[PDB]
Amino acid sequence: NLRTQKRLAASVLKCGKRKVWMDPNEISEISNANSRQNVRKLIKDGLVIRKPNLMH
Amino acid sequence: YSASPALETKCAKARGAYLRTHFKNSREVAFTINGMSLKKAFIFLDNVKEHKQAVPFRRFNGGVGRTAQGKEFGVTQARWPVKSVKFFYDLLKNAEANAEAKGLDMDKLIIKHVQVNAAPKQLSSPSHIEIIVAEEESRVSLKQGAKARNLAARKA
Amino acid sequence: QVVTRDYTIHMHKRLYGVSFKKRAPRAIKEIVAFAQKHMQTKEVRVDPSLNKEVWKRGIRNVPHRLRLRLSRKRSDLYTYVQAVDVANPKMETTVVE
RNA sequence: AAAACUUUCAGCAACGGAUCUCUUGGCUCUCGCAUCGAUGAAGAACGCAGCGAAAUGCGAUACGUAAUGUGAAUUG
RNA sequence: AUGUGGAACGGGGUAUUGUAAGCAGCUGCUGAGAUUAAGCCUUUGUUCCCAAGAUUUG
RNA sequence: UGGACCCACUAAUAGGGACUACUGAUGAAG
RNA sequence: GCAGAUCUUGGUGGAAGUAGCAUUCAAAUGAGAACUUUGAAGACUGAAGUGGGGAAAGGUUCCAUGUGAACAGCAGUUGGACAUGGGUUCCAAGGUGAACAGCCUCUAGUUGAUAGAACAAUGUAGAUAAGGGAAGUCGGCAAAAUGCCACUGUCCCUAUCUACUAUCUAGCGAAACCACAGCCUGGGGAACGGGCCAGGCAAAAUCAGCGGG
RNA sequence: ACCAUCUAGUAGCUGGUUC
RNA sequence: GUACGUGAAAUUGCUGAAAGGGAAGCAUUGGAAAUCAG
């Protein structure tokens, strides 16, 4: 489960849960990180991608 | 156990108690798989789990739907209780393992005894389950005797 | 054993009279069922993109005929099912090299 | 004219907790005594044990301290 | 359980609808195009499958 | 018999009594 | 000294396994996945929200980690559940439109209600119907006609179509009631009955309808 | 409206009443 | 074996035996099968 990781990533990226996307082949790496700094480092590395707003 | 067998000569035992399964379905599965060969029982339980055969319902047959897969046992009513079969499959795994421990010949094992008893009601009705596998394998009166004597002399 | 064959499906006869709300699910059901009866296998694996063209036109509107490719790839023998796009879906079953 | 099903009989196993035996309990009777509190009673609350949640014990000295007696424990 | 065998497509026939985009000058390509078995007929078309498993049987 | 004693049709519009069974569906067996 | 008291208390049955109770793909985890999670699609709620906050009230339900049960009326690897620690009434986008209407969205949020398979008798809800237009019914009951004439399946006379219940499957799973039982005709002074008498008769196990009794 | 006592009430009856 | 002394009946399951064409249970007389007894 990555509900806690998703919530932390959403808070760090200031984006909704729908806008947060994760690599299907990085479940172990995403689950390992539990700190806000680790989430930011993963976001910088590209592990978590923020989906841009679509249409209006 | 219930029956005079379970002598260590050619038997192996297993049991379960307070198993969270309905008593009536477990009884019907126990009645059906009684007397079969052990490996034969396994595929049959695999068939029931996969709907390629059905266990006849005989005593607790209230409201069972009639199916064509109950034709081998001569009944019209059949059902596929998969919860109780899973309980029986685990029990047969353990009984098979106990047969390994004692050192029988597993190719010729048969279900010699299987019995399901009601358990302390807790509502649901738990069931005690027990399985045994084993191997297969006047006078002559003075007048009556005198006539016998005379007829004995007669033949010679 | 390992073979790749390109098939085509006539869903309209297979979806004739099917409830509108269940048009899309039964479709996917039928493709996998079709897969078994032509691949002689029981378990399959469907490309998620294939389901995308299954659900392009919603839940109740499924195209009458679809073009599919079946590959008997070795298990980790499974059948990967892929969408194949052609200008017209009306050609005979082909054996893709 | 089988098996299944029902019923009856016996064996075995369940279920249930009767019966028997017991008992630091109750009940009854008799006998003895007179002793609460503004010097804060009866009752209540919160705490106090090494690990206790239980019952009693106790009040920040907190399952007690002082003194006397016994004599070498406490106990999961 | 190997054959005028069976299946999946495809072609033809029969049908329902009413002339598809695009091009050219309302008109012509256009009774076109689409659908056609899901309880329609047929198939020298292409491909595959089957010469099995379990049970019960004097 | 059809319509509000009636008014037509009609061959005629006579007078009266009042769990198991029922209907289908499987089915073991000499 | 118990067979009764719609006896008291406890235990146990038949009834009965009976009545009954909008998602799709792929991947990962896990003994075990239709319910956990991730990626994708389908959608749904839609700024008077299923959004973001507070007051009253609750009190640790907050957070991370851990999971044999029990609880989450299916399931469960998940959980406001269990265990261990840690922790202090306000705001209101776009289009349509007069509009904070309805509809579609924007940001955000949900996929949860046992599920599967079919579609037959019944019923519920909804439509169309040739010809006649109150002949049905105590009757314009209900729709139809708009938002004496006229319309209408009320009827002649019903037919067809759609969803759901319904049936079956996996799981979960009652209670009323119960002296004992359950074929029929006549007779048994009555009350003639389910038992008696005289007959008709009478072959397991069942499934679904009708409820006659 | 409820509660506890008086109460083990009025019972001219209903039911039961043990080898 | 902590669902712990003894473990009854109702009640359920398994095995063995027997019976059964719209009930059963009971009684008298015997037969058959089992099992005793002097």
**Beta bridge mates, A20:** A50
First-residue to last-residue Cα distance in chain B: 61
CA distance B105 to B11: 10
Q: What is the 3-state secondary structure (H, E, C) of chain B?
A: CCCCCCCCCCCEEEEEEEECCCHHHHHHHHHHCCCCEHHHHHHHHHHHHCCCCCEECCCCCCCCCECHHHCCCCCCEEECCHHHHHHHHHHHHHHHHHHHHHCCCHHHCEEEEEEEEECCCCCCCCEEEEEEEECCCCCCCHHHHHHHHHHHHHHC
What residue segments make up the domains of chain A, in order of their start? Answer: 3-50
CA distance C38 to C32: 10
What residue segments make up the domains of chain C, in order of their start? Answer: 1-97
Pairing of strands C45-46, C78-83: parallel
Per-residue flag: B119 CB under 7 A of strand D = yes
CA distance A51 to C62: 30
**Beta bridge mates, A21:** A49
Per-residue flag: C38 CB under 7 A of strand E = yes
- Give the technique used to solve this structure: cryo-EM
For the CA of C16 and the C1' of G118, the distance in angstroms is 14
CATH 3.40.50.1820 describes domain A3-50: no
Per-residue flag: C97 CB under 7 A of strand E = no
- Integer angstrom CA distances of residue B152 from B136, B141, B143, B155: 45, 15, 14, 6
CA distance C39 to C66: 18
For the CA of B2 and the C1' of I7, the distance in angstroms is 18
> Which has the closest alpha carbon to A49: A13, A3, A25?
A13
